[PDB]
Design a binder for these strands. Structure first.
Ligand SMILES: [Mg+2]
Ligand SMILES: [Mg+2]
Ligand SMILES: [Mg+2]
Ligand SMILES: [Mg+2]
Ligand SMILES: [Mg+2]
Ligand SMILES: [Mg+2]
Ligand SMILES: [Mg+2]
Ligand SMILES: [Mg+2]
Ligand SMILES: [Mg+2]
Ligand SMILES: [Mg+2]
Ligand SMILES: [Mg+2]
Ligand SMILES: [Mg+2]
Ligand SMILES: [Mg+2]
Ligand SMILES: [Mg+2]
Ligand SMILES: [Mg+2]
Ligand SMILES: [Mg+2]
Ligand SMILES: [Mg+2]
Ligand SMILES: [Mg+2]
Ligand SMILES: [Mg+2]
Ligand SMILES: [Mg+2]
Ligand SMILES: [Mg+2]
Ligand SMILES: [Mg+2]
Ligand SMILES: [Mg+2]
Ligand SMILES: [Mg+2]
Ligand SMILES: [Mg+2]
Ligand SMILES: [Mg+2]
Ligand SMILES: [Mg+2]
Ligand SMILES: [Mg+2]
Ligand SMILES: [Mg+2]
Ligand SMILES: [Mg+2]
Ligand SMILES: [Mg+2]
Ligand SMILES: [Mg+2]
Lengths: 82, 122, 129, 80, 205, 156
RNA sequence: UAGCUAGUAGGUGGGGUAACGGCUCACCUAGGCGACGAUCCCUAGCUGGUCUGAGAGGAUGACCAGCCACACUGGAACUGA
RNA sequence: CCCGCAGAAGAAGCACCGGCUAACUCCGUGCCAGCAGCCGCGGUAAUACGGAGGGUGCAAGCGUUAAUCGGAAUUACUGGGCGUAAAGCGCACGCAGGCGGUUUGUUAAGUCAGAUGUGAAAUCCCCGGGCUCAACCUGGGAACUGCAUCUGAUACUGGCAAG
């Protein structure tokens, strides 16, 4: 089904995840419906590092989209921080 | 020239043939020396230029120059050929590579050693 | 056959300027008159005069300044063998804006600058320098 | 308002069917000349109403045969 | 990756003094600065347009100690940047960290400054920077770290620098051994003998 | 202040009963850096003499050129028999992007920012002749205003 | 390489498909494609892009991503959304 | 990534130097041996072969070969030509095709204008940010010159009607 999950991008030892809506069958970095954010796990202080378009995510979930565990965690973090 | 004419029959790109077609767009190719001989240069030159007619791995029978002073070549001697003509042997389009398979490096060379397959002296 | 009357007119103007002719006459048409009017407005010719009823003749009075021709160059651009139309962003600047380009727009025949100001392209008739 | 194309009837022999050239006056990619290009289409026409040489308006539809995916909507300039 | 050969040799070839020696002793005393290096120095052949351009480029490269690939990259970057290309190139070269260290005076030559930078003697904004090509930015403090603060070479270099002409685009504290890179120098601020235009033409053949 | 530079020096021969007579031709170009440029073609049995003759010729018969802020006034083409030349004004800082002969002529003329190309033959003397002709013909906006009987502001 | 095509082109009616359809079958009509290149022959996975070039172009389609086709060679279906 | 230890210690080659093209001399050979991208060089004073010294250019690379575009306006749409350089059919008629004097009306096909939709992400470019710097990664823009639909304008070209 449609899911919301991290797509690994960046360099070796320096991952940068693009949060994408995509049909689960597709490969991790392959075909995707919509790109709804990003997450930078090695991002330093005085840098944003995370950004999730929450409205779009809400819309897709409403449509019936599953969410990756990591993406769910990110959402929780965003809510707390904000 | 007339726009109508061009539309009717457009402009042909000038298909340039290669001058080293035995390579077949390869940088080098291996072959076996069918025959090793000397030949006379063209009208502004006098020499006995060393050359070997070689059957390549891909079938072609070419003629190849052998640069450097002296060589350890004879019939049934596996060599690598490269691109380059001898302007003054007519119809010779390929050089042997000194410092490859059966071909030895030039003896006692101290300059352009990389061009003649000679290892660095002490 | 005569296949391009505008071109013929332009050629006549060029030849007159070359030959120091005071005026140049040719069969009048509405398009020709419009082009002539544009030319007068921009000041590349002194005057035009349409004369006759059944088959009227346009008579242009050519312009000289220091013994030499005012219209340095005058080339047809769009032509029957090859029509040229441009959009407002593609309108040409002749001689880096010094010369004018006669453009036939939806709102009548006008110079390139005028056409650009209006905001519409059209058939590029000719360049004049 | 529906999408529709006009064209001259190039043939009307095959029964309930006509062939409709849809000449378009395109510009040449390179040379810039405007060339007349043609588009033959097998159009379905029930009642065999169309003649040859007839101008006819057509719309696209679900395929009715191997070659026939257009239907006529109205005939115009149907003189002989 | 570095030129390790004779320096006055390079200077003689160029014609000018490239500041490859500390400047304690005059270059006229250290070498025949007028005569070019080698068997055929006592001869000045008439130089082609290409030749003159090449010589100027070589001069600049020798002055800073940049090899060709890096220099070419610098030129491309300058060309990309807005404004005058030669001017931009000069600014970038000046911006280099080894160069700034030399200007401040934490080294008699750029070779010495480069050595210090490589050997981790120099902190940029309180952070040990190791790369000689590091572009220093405006308002950047650059300082000798304490272990290198005891160096007699550093203090001698400071003395020599005091003798030299001070740069307008830096502000340096000799006791603190720290200098603030206030702004990238303008072309009027850099030396007039450099004809950047030749370099631009050469890399835009 | 009359900057001059020699474009090309070429050896030419004449044949006589004895044998060949060689001589040298020098194509030079002088200009004041404010608009005035002039080329000269001198011939003598030796090169320095030839150059001097060329220089004198160039210094005389110069020609004025309408320069707009150290650049061309509009894109201009120029021909002289084989040499057909194109040269286009360019933004400040572009430099002279111009061939050999062409570069020399432009530089002495005083154009600091140009984009040129020499089509056709690139025979130095003809190419220089073509460039000078093109530069000469190139009119300014004040000139166009005068011709058309308008203000310069109406034309822009 | 100038002619090619008899399920061929269209119709009616049955059958078939998840679905329109000569997809298939029976009959009827004699059509259909073609110098805007049909047919035949050679070569080739296509695209975003890549290299080059001032541009217009030219060449190209490794890597990364979208689409397609194949799975020793030739056929076939079954199961199943 | 940081700290400490010892000691200049373990770390420079490749091509070229007649012109184009930055860099020249001596010796050896003597149209030989050989070189060469082009033009050319060598037949007993070789800056062109081979060695040496000196120099030039790149540098952990440097040359050679292959391949593409460029220069090449040398397929010329932008942007060529055809008296003698390659190029006017031996001459005509004529179907398809290309082009069409002049006026008014009409249409709105070409043309032009505006909007809407799309033109995946990456890539290219601009301003930023993160790896000590760079490469590299990355945020946001711009661009994707296109295509489609709707609504207009009607000067020009096309269609239609009368002249
Ligand atoms: Mg051929
Ligand atoms: Mg000879
Ligand atoms: Mg490196
Ligand atoms: Mg049925
Ligand atoms: Mg049924
Ligand atoms: Mg294949
Ligand atoms: Mg394939
Ligand atoms: Mg070009
Ligand atoms: Mg593969
Ligand atoms: Mg399959
Ligand atoms: Mg299979
Ligand atoms: Mg297998
Ligand atoms: Mg099988
Ligand atoms: Mg199942
Ligand atoms: Mg099943
Ligand atoms: Mg030289
Ligand atoms: Mg050699
Ligand atoms: Mg001897
Ligand atoms: Mg000797
Ligand atoms: Mg040589
Ligand atoms: Mg030698
Ligand atoms: Mg070309
Ligand atoms: Mg020609
Ligand atoms: Mg002839
Ligand atoms: Mg004839
Ligand atoms: Mg008409
Ligand atoms: Mg017609
Ligand atoms: Mg329309
Ligand atoms: Mg994109
Ligand atoms: Mg940064
Ligand atoms: Mg109309
Ligand atoms: Mg009309």
């Amino acid at each position: 089904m449609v899911t919301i999950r991290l797509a690994r991008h960046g360099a070796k030892k320096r991952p940068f995840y693009q949060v994408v809506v995509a049909d689960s069958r597709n490969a991790r970095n392959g075909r995707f419906i919509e790109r709804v954010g990003f997450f930078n796990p090695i991002a330093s202080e005085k840098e944003e590092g995370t950004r999730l378009d929450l409205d779009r995510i809400a819309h897709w979930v409403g449509q019936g989209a599953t969410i990756s565990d990591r993406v769910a965690a990110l959402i929780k973090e965003v809510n707390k921080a904000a | 020239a007339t726009v109508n004419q061009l539309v009717r029959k457009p402009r042909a790109r000038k298909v340039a043939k290669s001058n080293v077609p035995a390579l077949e767009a390869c940088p080098q190719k291996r072959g076996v020396c069918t025959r090793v001989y000397t030949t006379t240069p063209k009208k502004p030159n006098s020499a006995l230029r060393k050359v070997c007619r070689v059957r390549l791995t891909n079938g072609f029978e070419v003629t190849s120059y052998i640069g450097g002073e002296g060589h350890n070549l004879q019939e049934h001697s596996v060599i690598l050929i490269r691109g380059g003509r001898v302007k003054d042997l007519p119809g010779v389009r390929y050089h042997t590579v000194r410092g490859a398979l059966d071909c030895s490096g030039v003896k006692d060379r101290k300059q352009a050693r990389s061009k003649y397959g000679v290892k660095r002296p002490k | 056959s005569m296949q391009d009357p505008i071109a013929d007119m332009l050629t006549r103007i060029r030849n007159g300027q070359a030959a120091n002719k005071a005026a140049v006459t040719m069969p009048s048409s509405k398009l020709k008159v419009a082009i002539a009017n544009v030319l007068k407005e921009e000041g590349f010719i002194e005057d035009f005069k349409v004369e006759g009823d059944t088959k009227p003749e346009l008579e242009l009075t050519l312009k000289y300044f220091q013994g030499k021709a005012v219209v340095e160059s005058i080339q047809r651009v769009s032509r029957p063998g090859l029509r040229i139309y441009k959009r407002k962003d593609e309108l040409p600047k002749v001689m880096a804006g010094l010369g004018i380009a006669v453009v036939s727009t939806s709102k009548g025949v006008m110079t390139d600058r005028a056409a650009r100001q209006a905001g519409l392209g059209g058939e590029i008739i000719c360049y004049v320098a | 308002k529906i999408r529709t194309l006009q064209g001259r009837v190039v043939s009307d022999k095959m029964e309930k069917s006509i062939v409709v050239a849809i000449e378009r006056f395109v510009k040449h990619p390179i040379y810039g000349k405007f060339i007349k290009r043609t588009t033959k289409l097998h159009v379905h026409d029930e009642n065999n109403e169309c003649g040859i040489g007839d101008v006819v308006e057509i719309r696209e539809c679900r395929p009715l045969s191997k070659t026939k995916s257009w239907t006529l909507v109205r005939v115009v300039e149907k003189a002989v | 990756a570095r030129y390790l050969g004779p320096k006055l040799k390079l200077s003689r070839r160029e014609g000018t003094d490239l500041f490859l020696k500390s400047g304690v002793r005059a270059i006229d005393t250290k070498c025949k600065i007028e005569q070019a290096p080698g068997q055929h120095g006592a001869r000045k052949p008439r130089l082609s347009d290409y030749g003159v351009q090449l010589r100027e480029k070589q001069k600049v490269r020798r002055i800073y100690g940049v090899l060709e690939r890096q220099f070419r990259n610098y030129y491309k970057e300058a060309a990309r940047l807005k404004g005058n290309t030669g001017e931009n190139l000069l600014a970038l070269l000046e911006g280099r960290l080894d160069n700034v260290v030399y200007r401040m005076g934490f080294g008699a030559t750029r070779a010495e400054a480069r050595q210090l930078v490589s050997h981790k003697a120099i902190m940029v904004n309180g952070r040990v920077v190791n790369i000689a090509s590091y572009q220093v930015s405006p308002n950047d403090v650059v300082s000798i770290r304490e272990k290198a603060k005891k160096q007699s070479r550093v203090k001698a270099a400071l003395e020599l620098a005091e003798q030299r002409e001070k740069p307008t685009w830096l502000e340096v504290d000799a006791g603190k051994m720290e200098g603030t890179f206030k702004r990238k120098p303008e072309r009027s601020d850099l030396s007039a003998d450099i004809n950047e235009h030749l370099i631009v033409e050469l890399y835009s053949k | 202040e009359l900057q001059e530079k020699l474009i090309a020096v070429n050896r030419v021969s004449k044949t006589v009963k004895g044998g060949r007579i060689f001589s040298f031709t020098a194509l030079t170009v002088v200009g004041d850096g404010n608009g005035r440029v002039g080329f000269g073609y001198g011939k003598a049995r030796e090169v320095p003499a030839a150059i001097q003759k060329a220089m004198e010729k160039a210094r005389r018969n110069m020609i004025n050129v309408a320069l707009n802020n150290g650049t061309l006034q509009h894109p201009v083409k120029g021909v002289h028999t084989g040499s057909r030349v194109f040269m286009q004004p360019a933004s400040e800082g572009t430099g002279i992007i111009a061939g050999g002969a062409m570069r020399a002529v432009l530089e002495v003329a005083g154009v600091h920012n140009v984009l040129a190309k020499a089509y056709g033959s690139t025979n130095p003397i003809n190419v220089v002749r073509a460039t000078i002709d093109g530069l000469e013909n190139m009119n300014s906006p004040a000139m166009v205003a005068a011709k058309r009987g308008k203000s310069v502001e109406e034309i822009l």
